Every structure is written in structure tokens, then in C-alpha cells.
């Protein structure tokens, strides 16, 4: 009897359109625990380096997390997972909400879509029942709009639909997938499901899910129900609202924004403006969002609702949650009312909210400089927000200039030239960053920006503060409680840093502290990545209810399995080096490496060079970023080992 | 967690080379239990009707039983599956010994094999260690000795290796696959095996295997080795020795062999000998049989060690157990001194010892008949003896009139034609039947003949007694204590039956009787066969330790899922139903269904189809022996019953 895990996944070929349920290999679940990890198994066994992203034989994995559909505070990821047709590398992409719950309540773990269908269709599951079924009907339809329409067609009010909209149709690079409040955002999984000619996939669910200790489960659940009580009484002292409390930045709820808007870079990632935040802009602001807010809205199982159901006169209704509010504003040099607007158009179109706003301001710097000609942008309005919308729809439908805009800021500006190149500056490995161009080197942000495989900064940080505190009496209380620390040591570390001086950045924390630090954080992330429970109440804020010290409990008494601290950092280290050698097989290498040439005013090759050469040795890597034979043998990664080997990429 | 399998199977493309270790699905356990039925399931869906014997697509299967590597005593048997070159139908066939339990300790249900080695091969399994290894060395050799070389080469003295000799190599549709004292002997697997250019498979298993409630289980497996010390202590009274206890027929170990030298045919399946056990011949083959038994052997975990050591001077030890005792002794109306000598040779070549012998006979009477002339038999020694060695050796390296012998008597008949078929009298959906040839109608075994799957009257027979009593307090004593019964109907029908008189063959017991008889002996034969359980301790002898009430326990315990026994009888029917419905796939029909024209002297027609109607009715099937699309969806087997209809065997409506 399997427990947490319903042991199930369907494969789905699409050129085909045969479905079959295939019974898991409990073995993968004790090494790569689920979500993520297990993933991250499949496209490592199955999808070699020759395969492209619009080729029949890359994989689209939609994945629930272990732990989802168990009564877990907040545990209800999807994790999407694919060849990312923008970084040429892996894209896994996590999304919220309630679909990954109603997958497990219909007895799968994971679908596996594979091959390409010819006609547009969706998937159809409801507990054992499970088809393929024309969608031509909802060509072209939002992703939203789309859910609507097809729980009104199949007569299931309470099914659950992850959809792309016209940008995932037409293969944009940075194409979503959304689902009610929820959205798979980055990497481009959108286009590899409009490449397979999927619209849609619907599932409703009515079987149980069961856990192995029934009583020890619901105790953690409770537990974390009470320090959800406790923090939220008790916010991280000095620090910014958005970030004091749990949950996904809680940009829904505070009106403040005077961190984000005068210290992340406006436009292109461009323009800093230091004294943004007036009386003026804080009251028009807030009016707009108070008149827009229709319902702040959890995710499934969870008090923090982070979220909210936005309504803009003369539009649909729309759901958002965190930095998606100012994205569009802010790289378009507008209001927050102008952000909202167009949001609603993206969302529905299914675009990352993240690289789409760089997208479009990289290609009116690139009309200014005179790089791109006005003629390029036929009947374009000269009134800057109208320009955003219009730009938006080339982009989208691959019009022209949209269609090489649709490619993102590296290939558009490859493709175009006159250096163009040049203004494509914000990019890790092909991925547009967050628009922060920051004056001193930061150690610890420069590891996570060179190594992480999301390559995206708010998914890799979280659990130790992004500052220090001036006093040493505030940092005492700080580490007093924080009982989330896998080692006093880091307590230490937060007692000794200070904002000035002789143990300040970048020289402090040291260089073997800082290598500690970015393990810590982005193990935290992984095992959220693979149980399926939001970062919101785990990984990303200050002191969660969720720790390295009671998720063993919760995987021992939810799956059945033996696990404990020990085990599970190991486990955690065993697929997040699996990943990394699937980026290793594709062609990924220390050079790669490197955060945008512009992303510090102050730079220090020598201590970045040793930050980095310190970091490969801690996860076990040689001095080209390769996870070493020696490595992967103890990890149990043998058969990695060997195909390194065999294609050269380690020598014996 | 899984408990008793191990939950993962080893898929071998051999073409390719691929090895790859799968986990199984365990709703697959709870439908059909494990070793033979889950062979069937595997079959039913990737080997379609159109696929050949000696295809590369065609499947080798080797599955250890459900129970094997546990505690339960004489829980040994592999399973292996393939469609037969001979039958065209699904072959099973069953060896004891050693082997399954290692592959469980190994950490595997099964090895399936796909494809064709270009090269001779083996395969070497130890714990999660699998390779591939030329076998080109060891081309021609015997089955043991094969065994014998690789686990010196290999360095691995406690390994249990499965191997083909030449007569498997060169495809003889009745080569077999030798294993110590054990034998996976009939329908051609070896054929299938050695088509695939596999010559062994090598297995060390160190693991630990499992059980669900280990107390529970002990106490199951004492229970049984206490049922058995008493039931040894008891033989059923005035009974034959050699089917009087528990084990597989005791040949090797009594000595007696007046009951199947005077009521069994001679030659090919031709002559009876009413009076053929003097004291003149009992005396000489009580001396061979003493002189040349080494030692009575074990399978693993069992007691009754049913097999022996042969030891004939000058030749190479083998073992032997049961009835190849005798059928080459009987096929060349010879002493039992030949029959060991030759059956060593045709044990280390792997041959099956039931159609080897009637195939060579046949081929003899042929010559005498001038069917085949001496044109056909080039240096064809004068001894007859010495002419069965000859023939022996044709027949293996399918040289000459071999390559046609090679085929069975079925494809060698029509091949050689001009009325050879006459004298392929003695098969049943080409497969040669035990040499019987009886005088009256027996209605239980007429029904047994023509559905049994295994289509051998020695693996569907067993619970119910082959004879009559005939006094009535022998009768009462019997089923006094006769607990393995699945109702009291049985008791009652066993106390009305008599040797002569109005309650005797072939009008009682009944049309009705005889089909909830044949049901329950067929019954047991799948349970164990999907177990593992030896038929020696189950199925095959009267008065069993298992039994269909307390085999539901053992499975509880030892597999940790829910069974009772009306659960386990419908799970039987289930995987039976699916093994009938993989056969009718492949063209079989009630036409198929028929015994020898002279299988008994005096025959009923009426009765015949009246027999075969009703047992028919009983499993769920058409009046052509087809699974009806009803009966296929109360055993959950929809998909059957679908495919039946989209194929135009099944009728809509
Ligand atoms: C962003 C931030 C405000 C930057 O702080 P600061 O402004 O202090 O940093 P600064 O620009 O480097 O320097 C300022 C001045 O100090 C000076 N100086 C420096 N070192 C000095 C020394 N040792 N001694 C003396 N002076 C030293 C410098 O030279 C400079 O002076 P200048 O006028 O001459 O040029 C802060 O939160 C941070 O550190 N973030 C971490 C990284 C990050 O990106 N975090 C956010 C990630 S996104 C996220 O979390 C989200 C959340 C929600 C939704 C979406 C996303
Ligand atoms: C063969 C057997 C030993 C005795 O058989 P019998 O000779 O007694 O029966 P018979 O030959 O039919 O008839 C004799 C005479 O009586 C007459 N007559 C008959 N009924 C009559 C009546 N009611 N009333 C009046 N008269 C009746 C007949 O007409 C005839 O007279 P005739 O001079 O005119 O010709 C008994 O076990 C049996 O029949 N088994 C059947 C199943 C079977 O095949 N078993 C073995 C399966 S393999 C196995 O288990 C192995 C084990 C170990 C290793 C390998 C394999
Ligand atoms: N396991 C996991 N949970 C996560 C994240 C993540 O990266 N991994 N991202 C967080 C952030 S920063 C946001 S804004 C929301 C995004 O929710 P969505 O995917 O439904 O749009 O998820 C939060 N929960
Ligand atoms: N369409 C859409 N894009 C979005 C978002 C969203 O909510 N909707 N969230 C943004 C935020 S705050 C984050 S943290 C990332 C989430 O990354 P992921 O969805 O690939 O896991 O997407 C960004 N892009
Ligand atoms: N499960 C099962 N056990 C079985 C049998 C069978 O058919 N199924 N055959 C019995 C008979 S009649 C004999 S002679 C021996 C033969 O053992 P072997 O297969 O190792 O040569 O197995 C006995 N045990
Ligand atoms: N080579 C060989 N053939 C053999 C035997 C054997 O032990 N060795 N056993 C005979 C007996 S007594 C039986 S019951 C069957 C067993 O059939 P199976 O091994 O195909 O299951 O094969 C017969 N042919
Ligand atoms: S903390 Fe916020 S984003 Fe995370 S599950 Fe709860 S409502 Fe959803
Ligand atoms: S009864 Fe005989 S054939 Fe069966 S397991 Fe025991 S020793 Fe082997
Ligand atoms: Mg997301
Ligand atoms: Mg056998
Ligand atoms: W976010
Ligand atoms: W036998």
C-alpha cells in the first residue's frame, strides 16, 4: 500500500492519442522523494541532449507535489516540467491553487504528455475516466475564459483547469499556464503545451487520499496551524511589511511599496528613481488598488490568501498575486492603474509577467536608438501606455516584429543586431532577471544568481535575512527562536554581520559562511519543489512553520517511508545534482555562470572567483560547475556517472 | 510496501541488449495472485495472435510464484510462459528445485525476455547486478554441464542456473530447460528459448524476501509440516504406493511398477501388456533401480524428496523424478536399465521425457509399416536399443528424418504423409497425450483431456480419487476426515460410487458431478501454479497440508492483501478465463477439444457432448468453449471480452 503518493501517473501521446496508467517505482520515491525530484528522473531517463523543445519527443510533465492532497497547511503545488524552448535547458515551474490536490483526489501523481497532436485538444480526467477531446472550439481563448467554457461543456462545475491562452498557441518563448489564481509562469512551459497542440487539461477527482500515521500527520498540522497563529502575531521586527509576515509576498494586502518602486530599476531594468515614493503617488495608488481589490483569496488549504480576484471597470475579472502588480508599470514608466489594465490582457493571453514587461521595454529602448525602425512597428500609436497594449497583441500572435520579439530579449536581440545585443543586459542563461541593478557586490545573491537552475532570485532565497540588523540587541532577538536553523552556526553568522564595517558585505560574511548560506536556502526550495508545499509557508519567508526539523515527520508519517534530517538533506542534494547534470548534458558549464556584467556598480573578480570555486567544492563539483564521479557514486547517481563518462563530459 | 513478491520484474530485450528493471503494478497482485496468472496477463497484452513462436516479438517468460522465498514448505516452482512452436497456443510449464526462490532473494517476480540474441548468450543475475555474457563457448553443450562450466567461470558455486542443451539450441519443438533436479520439460519452451540464442540464466540472490505478519505465516508453515508428519504416518488405504502419499509419484522411491508396466501402453501408446510384472522382472528392476539410485534428493524447503541421483555406470550422474522413469523403457518395449541410460542422454540435451519417447516410437512403427523405409535412416544400427540412441542423436541436431522427428509427432506426420497420420494417434491439440489407452469411458477424464490448458491429464488431475472403492466402510473411512473438500457434495460422491452396478462409469457420478470435479482439481493446479506451490504438496495427491481453506490465509499473511476463499476460487477462474481466452485469441475452438478417437474402447457420443456441454455452461463459456462477454465482465475482465467483440469472436448481442 502506498501512502501520500497515489503510485499512479498517466502517459498521454498526444500523436497518438493513447493513455495509459502506469504503476511508479516506490524506489524513486525514497531517493527522489516526488514533484520535482521524481521529474526530474523521468527527463533525465527519457530525453536525451538531441531532443529540441518543439521536437514530438520532448516531455511536458504536470506533477503533484508528494504531500498535496494530504491535510497539510498549504501543500498544493503543481510542478510543470520540460525542455525550456528560451534556455535551450531545463524549465520546472511550480503553480498553486487547487489543481495539483484534484490530480492526487483522481489517483494520479503526475501526467506525462509526450508526442504532438495534430488537431488542438484537451485532457479530460475524472478519477478513472480519462479522455482526449476535441478543443478547436477554444482556439485562440483566454486561459481563463477557456476553463469556463469547458466545466460548462463537460457539466463539472467543480473541475479544476490548467490552460494556456493564445500566447501558448502560438509557441512564445515566455508563455504561461494558468489556472484560477494559479499560473506555471516561467521557462516557456506554455509553448511546449501549445506546441502539443494542448489547450487544456481538466481534471476533477472524488477518491481518497491516504496517509501512513494518521494521527502523528494531523499533529504536525496542527502544529503549523499554531505557529501560523503565533508568527502572525509576532512579525520579523524592522523589515519592510511585504516581507515580515508568511506567505507569498503579500503585495495583495499592503499598499506600501516604497522598497520595490526606489530600489528596482524601471523600463528596460534602466532607471532607478530613489525618491519615487511621494504622499501624492502613495494615496493614488492605494485608491486604485482599494477600488480594484474585489477579494483577497487562499490557495487550497491555506489562512495567508495572498492572492486577489482584481476587477477593472470595462474588464473581465482577473486573479493575481505578488511582484506581477508592478512589473508591467514599472517597465513601462506608468501608474499602478495602467499595471492592472494590462495584466489582465497577459493573463489571459498566458505570458510571464516577469520577462514579457523587459520584453517590450527592451524593444522601444531598441526603437529609440534608432537599432529598430519606426517602420517596424506599423500603425503604432505614439501614446506610451497604448503602445504597451499594441506591442503586447504583435507579440502574442508573432506579428512581425512580435514574432521576434516573442523569442525573448537574447534571441530577439541575436536575431536582430546593431547591437542590439547590448541592450539585452539583464540575462542569466538566455532568462531575463529581476530588474535590480544594485551598487555593492553581494556574495551571497551572486552564488544564487550564477548557480540556480530556476534561474530566478526570488526562488532560491528566503530563509536567512536579506540584510543585517544595526543593533546588536535586535540580532540576539532574532536568533533567539529561530529554531528553523539546521546549525547554530548560523545564528552566529546573523550576530556578527552588520549593514557597516568590518564585518560587512561583501568582504563579510565570509566566503565558506556565504557557501553555507545559498545550500541552505536553495535546499529549502527543492524539498518544497518535491513535497509540492507553497514557499510561502517553507522556503521563502523569515522563520516558517515549515523547517528542516519537522519535514522529515511529515514525509515519514504522510508516505510510510523512513526519513529523517540527515536523510533528507541528502535527499534533497541527490535531485538537485540530477538536475544539474541534465543541464550539464545539455550543454551548461561554469561559463555560463554569470550574472549580467551590469548587475553591481562594484565588482571583485578575485572574491567571486573564489565564491564560486568555494561553492562548486561544497556541492561536490569540479571547477567547471560538472558533479564529479565521486559525488554522484555516494549520492546513488552511479548511472550519471557513467554516461558522463561515456560522453566525455567527465573524464576517468 | 510489497510483501512476498518482490514487486519488480527484469524486462531483456535481447536483440538490443537492454536491461531494464521495472515495478509492477499491484492491483496486478489482487487480480491475478502472481506466477502463472500474471504470466498470462503479460502475455494477453503484448504478444497478439499474430505474432509467431519464432518471432522476435514473442515473450520468454520466467516467473517465480507469489509465495516462493518465503517459509512455505515445498514453495518453489518457477513458471515459464511463451506461446509453444508446437501448439501454436500458450505454453506454461513449471520447474521445481532451486531457481525461483533465488530469483526472489534476488530481488525479482519475473525475467521477461523479448527479442533475439544474434549471439549466443546468458544471462548472470546477482542481487541488483544483471549482465549479458557470451555463451559461445558453450555452444553443444548439456544442460547441466552448461550449469557446471559457467558457475566455475563465474566464480559463483551457490548460483541455481536454468539452461537449454542441443536439442533447445536447434529448436526441437519439445526441448526442454534443465535446472539441478528440475525441469521445465513440456510444450517447447526450450525451443523458444534457444531461438532467442539464450543458453542459461545464471541467478544468485542474497536479499531478504518478506512477509506481511510474520507470526500469522510461521504458524501457517508449522501447521503444514505437522499435517504432514501425520499424513505420512497414514497412506491412503488400499491404494497403489505410489499415489498412496504426499510428493510427486514416488517412482524413484517404490519400486513397484506393476500398475504402470500392465495398464499403460508399450511402444507408441500401442500395446498393453496385462500380465507384464512377474517376479522374474520385479526382482531385475528392483536391482538396477537399487545399484543405480545415489540418493533421494529435495527441492528446496520440502521434505518429501521426491527426485533421485542417477548414477549408470560410465555415464554422467543426472536426476530423475516421476514418470520419465519409464517412458523410454516403455516406448522401446525395454527394461528399465535402458530407460536410465538413454533418458541421461536425452536429460543433458533437454529433451521432454514424455513426447520423446512416443516420437521416436512412432518414427519405429512408421518403418515397420513402410511408411518410412531404411533410406530414411542412414547406419541405423540392428540392436533396438541400440536404434533409439541413433535415432536420439538424428533427432537432436535435426539431422536427416531428425529434422522432421524434431517437429512432434503432429507436424511429422503430415510432413511425412502417406498415412503416417494414422499413427499419430495419441495427441490433443498436437501434443502428445500419456500413453493411454483405457476400455471404458471415464467422464471425469474425458472432461479433463479435452479443456485442460496444460493439455497433460497429469497436471489438471489430483483431488478427487481415480477409482472407486469397493466396499462402503472404505468409502466412510476416507471421507471422514477429509477436510480439503470445498463443500460436503464431494464426500457424498465418493460414497455412491462403485466399481460395477448402477452407480459406476460411465453414468455416475453424474454429467453434474463430473463437472464440479473437474472444476475443483482444475482449481487447485492454478492456485498452485500462481503460487508457486508445489502440486506435490497441493494439487497433485489426495489429502493435501494446502488446501482451498487454508490457502487464502497463507496468501493474507504472506502477501498482505485481503483474500477468503471465495475471493481466491473467483481469482482462479479470473487468470483460468484468461489463459482459455489467450488460446481462443489464437484460433482454438470446441473442435479443438477432442480426445484420441481410441482413447477408450467404448465411447458415447451422447453422453461425450452432454459432458462437454454442461462443463462448458459451468465455466461461463459459449457452447464453442468461448468465454461469454458475462462471464468475462464478472471476473473484471471487460477489456477480454472487448477486444473478443471488436475481433468478430464474440458475437454483439
Ligand atoms: C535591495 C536592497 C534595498 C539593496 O540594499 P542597498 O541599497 O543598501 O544596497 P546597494 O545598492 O548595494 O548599496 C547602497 C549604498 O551602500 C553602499 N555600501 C554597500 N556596502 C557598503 C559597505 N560595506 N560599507 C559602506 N557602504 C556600503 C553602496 O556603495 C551604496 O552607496 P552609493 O550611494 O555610493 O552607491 C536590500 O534589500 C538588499 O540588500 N537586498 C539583497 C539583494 C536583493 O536583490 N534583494 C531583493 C531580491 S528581489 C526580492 O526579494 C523580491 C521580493 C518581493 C517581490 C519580488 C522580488
Ligand atoms: C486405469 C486404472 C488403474 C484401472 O482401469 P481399468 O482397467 O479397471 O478400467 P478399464 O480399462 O476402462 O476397464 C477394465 C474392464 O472393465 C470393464 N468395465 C469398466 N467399467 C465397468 C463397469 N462400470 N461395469 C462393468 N464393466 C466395466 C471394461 O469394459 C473392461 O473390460 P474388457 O475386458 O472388455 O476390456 C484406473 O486408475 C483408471 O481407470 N484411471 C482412469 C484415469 C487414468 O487415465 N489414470 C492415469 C492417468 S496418468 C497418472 O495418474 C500418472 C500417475 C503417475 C505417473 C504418470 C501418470
Ligand atoms: N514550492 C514552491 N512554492 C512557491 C514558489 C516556488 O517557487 N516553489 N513560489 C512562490 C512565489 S514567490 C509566488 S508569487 C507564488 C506563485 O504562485 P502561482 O505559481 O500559483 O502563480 O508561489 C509561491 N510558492
Ligand atoms: N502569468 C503570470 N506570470 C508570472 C506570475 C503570475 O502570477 N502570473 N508570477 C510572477 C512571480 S511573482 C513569480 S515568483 C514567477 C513564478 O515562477 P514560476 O511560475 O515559473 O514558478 O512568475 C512571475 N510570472
Ligand atoms: N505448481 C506445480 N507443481 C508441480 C507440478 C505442476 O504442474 N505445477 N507438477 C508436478 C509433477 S507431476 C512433477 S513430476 C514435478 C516435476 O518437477 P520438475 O518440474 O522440477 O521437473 O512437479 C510436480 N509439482
Ligand atoms: N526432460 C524432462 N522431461 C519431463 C520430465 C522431466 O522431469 N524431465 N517430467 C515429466 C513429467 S512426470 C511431467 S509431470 C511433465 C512436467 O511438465 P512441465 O515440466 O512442462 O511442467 O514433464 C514430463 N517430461
Ligand atoms: S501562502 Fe499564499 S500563495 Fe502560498 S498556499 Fe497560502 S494562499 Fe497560496
Ligand atoms: S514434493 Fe517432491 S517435487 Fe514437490 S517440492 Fe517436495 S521434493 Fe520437490
Ligand atoms: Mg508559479
Ligand atoms: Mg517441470
Ligand atoms: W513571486
Ligand atoms: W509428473
Same mark, same amino acid.
Given at each position: 500500500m502506498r501512502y501520500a503518493e497515489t503510485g499512479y501517473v498517466l502517459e498521454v501521446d498526444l500523436t497518438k492519442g493513447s493513455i495509459e496508467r502506469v504503476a511508479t517505482d516506490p524506489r524513486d520515491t525514497e531517493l527522489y522523494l516526488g514533484g520535482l525530484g521524481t521529474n526530474a528522473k523521468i527527463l533525465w531517463d527519457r530525453?536525451?541532449?538531441?531532443?529540441?523543445?518543439?521536437?514530438?519527443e520532448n516531455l511536458l510533465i504536470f506533477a503533484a507535489g508528494?504531500?498535496?492532497?494530504?491535510?497539510?497547511?498549504?501543500?498544493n503545488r503543481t510542478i510543470v516540467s520540460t525542455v525550456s524552448p528560451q534556455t535551450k535547458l531545463m524549465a520546472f515551474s511550480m503553480m498553486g491553487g487547487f489543481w495539483a490536490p484534484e490530480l492526487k483526489y483522481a489517483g494520479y501523481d503526475k501526467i506525462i504528455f509526450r508526442g504532438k497532436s495534430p488537431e488542438l485538444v484537451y485532457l479530460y480526467i475524472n478519477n478513472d475516466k480519462v479522455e482526449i477531446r476535441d478543443a478547436? =472550439?477554444? +482556439?485562440?481563448?483566454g486561459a481563463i475564459e477557456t476553463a469556463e467554457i469547458i466545466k460548462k461543456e463537460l457539466n463539472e462545475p467543480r473541475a479544476q483547469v490548467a490552460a494556456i491562452g493564445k500566447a501558448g498557441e502560438n509557441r512564445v518563448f515566455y508563455a504561461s499556464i494558468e489556472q484560477g489564481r494559479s499560473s506555471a509562469s516561467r521557462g516557456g512551459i506554455g509553448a511546449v503545451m501549445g506546441d502539443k497542440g494542448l489547450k487544456a487539461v481538466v481534471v476533477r477527482g472524488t477518491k481518497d487520499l491516504c496517509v501512513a500515521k494518521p494521527e502523528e500527520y494531523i499533529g504536525l498540522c496542527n502544529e503549523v496551524l499554531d505557529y501560523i497563529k503565533h508568527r502572525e502575531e509576532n512579525p520579523?521586527?524592522?523589515?519592510?511589511?511585504?516581507?515580515?509576515?508568511?506567505?507569498?509576498?503579500?503585495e495583495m494586502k499592503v499598499h506600501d511599496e516604497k522598497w520595490h518602486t526606489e530600489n528596482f530599476n524601471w523600463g528596460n531594468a534602466r532607471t532607478?528613481? +530613489?525618491?519615487?515614493?511621494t504622499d501624492e503617488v502613495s494615496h493614488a495608488w492605494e485608491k486604485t488598488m482599494d477600488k480594484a481589490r474585489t477579494r483577497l483569496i487562499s490557495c487550497?488549504?491555506?489562512?495567508?490568501?495572498?492572492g486577489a480576484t482584481i476587477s477593472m471597470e470595462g474588464l473581465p475579472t482577473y486573479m493575481m498575486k505578488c511582484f506581477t502588480k508592478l512589473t508591467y508599470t514599472m517597465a513601462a514608466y506608468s501608474d499602478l492603474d495602467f499595471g492592472l489594465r494590462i495584466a489582465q490582457k497577459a493573463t489571459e493571453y498566458g505570458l510571464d509577467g516577469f520577462s514579457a514587461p523587459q520584453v517590450m521595454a527592451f524593444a522601444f529602448e531598441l526603437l529609440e536608438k534608432g537599432?529598430?525602425?519606426?517602420?517596424?512597428?506599423?500603425?503604432?500609436?505614439?501614446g506610451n501606455e497604448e503602445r504597451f497594449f499594441y506591442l503586447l497583441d504583435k507579440i502574442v500572435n508573432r506579428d512581425g516584429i512580435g514574432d521576434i520579439l516573442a523569442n525573448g530579449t537574447y534571441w530577439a536581440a541575436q536575431e536582430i543586431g546593431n547591437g542590439a545585443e547590448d541592450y539585452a =543586459?539583464?540575462?542569466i542563461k538566455k532568462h531575463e532577471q529581476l530588474p535590480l541593478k544594485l551598487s555593492m557586490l553581494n556574495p551571497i545573491y551572486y552564488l544564487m544568481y550564477c548557480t540556480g537552475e530556476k534561474i530566478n532570485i526570488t526562488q532560491i532565497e528566503?530563509?536567512?535575512?536579506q540584510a543585517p540588523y544595526p543593533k546588536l540587541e535586535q540580532r540576539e532577538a532574532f536568533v533567539e527562536?529561530?529554531?528553523?536553523?539546521?546549525?547554530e552556526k548560523f545564528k552566529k553568522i546573523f550576530l556578527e554581520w552588520?549593514?557597516?564595517?568590518?564585518?560587512?558585505?561583501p568582504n563579510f560574511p565570509t566566503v565558506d559562511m556565504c557557501c553555507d548560506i545559498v545550500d541552505w536556502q536553495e535546499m529549502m526550495h527543492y524539498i518544497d519543489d518535491a513535497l509540492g508545499?507553497?514557499?510561502?509557508?517553507?522556503?521563502?519567508?523569515? +522563520?516558517?512553520?515549515?523547517?528542516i526539523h519537522n519535514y522529515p515527520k511529515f514525509i515519514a508519517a504522510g508516505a510510510g517511508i523512513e526519513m529523517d534530517t540527515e536523510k533528507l538533506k541528502k535527499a534533497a542534494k541527490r535531485y538537485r545534482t540530477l538536475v544539474r547534470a541534465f543541464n550539464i548534458r545539455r550543454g551548461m558549464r561554469r561559463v555560463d555562470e554569470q550574472p549580467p556584467?551590469?548587475?553591481?556598480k562594484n565588482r571583485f573578480p578575485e572574491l567571486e572567483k573564489e565564491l564560486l570555486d568555494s561553492y562548486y567544492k561544497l556541492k561536490g563539483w569540479?571547477?567547471?560547475g560538472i558533479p564529479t564521479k565521486e559525488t554522484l557514486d555516494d549520492l546513488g547517481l552511479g548511472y550519471v556517472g557513467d554516461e558522463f563518462i561515456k560522453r566525455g563530459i567527465l573524464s576517468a
Open positions: 530525453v536525451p541532449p538531441e531532443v529540441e523543445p518543439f521536437s514530438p508528494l504531500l498535496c492532497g494530504t491535510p497539510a497547511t498549504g501543500c478547436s =472550439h477554444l +482556439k485562440g481563448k520579523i521586527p524592522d523589515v519592510m511589511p511585504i516581507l515580515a509576515g508568511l506567505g507569498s509576498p503579500q532607478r528613481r +530613489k525618491d519615487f515614493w487550497y488549504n491555506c489562512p495567508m490568501k495572498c537599432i529598430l525602425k519606426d517602420s517596424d512597428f506599423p500603425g503604432l500609436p505614439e =543586459h539583464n540575462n528566503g530563509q536567512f535575512p527562536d529561530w529554531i528553523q536553523v539546521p546549525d552588520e549593514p557597516r564595517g568590518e564585518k560587512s558585505m508545499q507553497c514557499a510561502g509557508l517553507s522556503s521563502f519567508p523569515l +522563520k516558517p512553520p515549515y523547517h556584467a551590469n548587475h553591481w569540479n571547477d567547471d
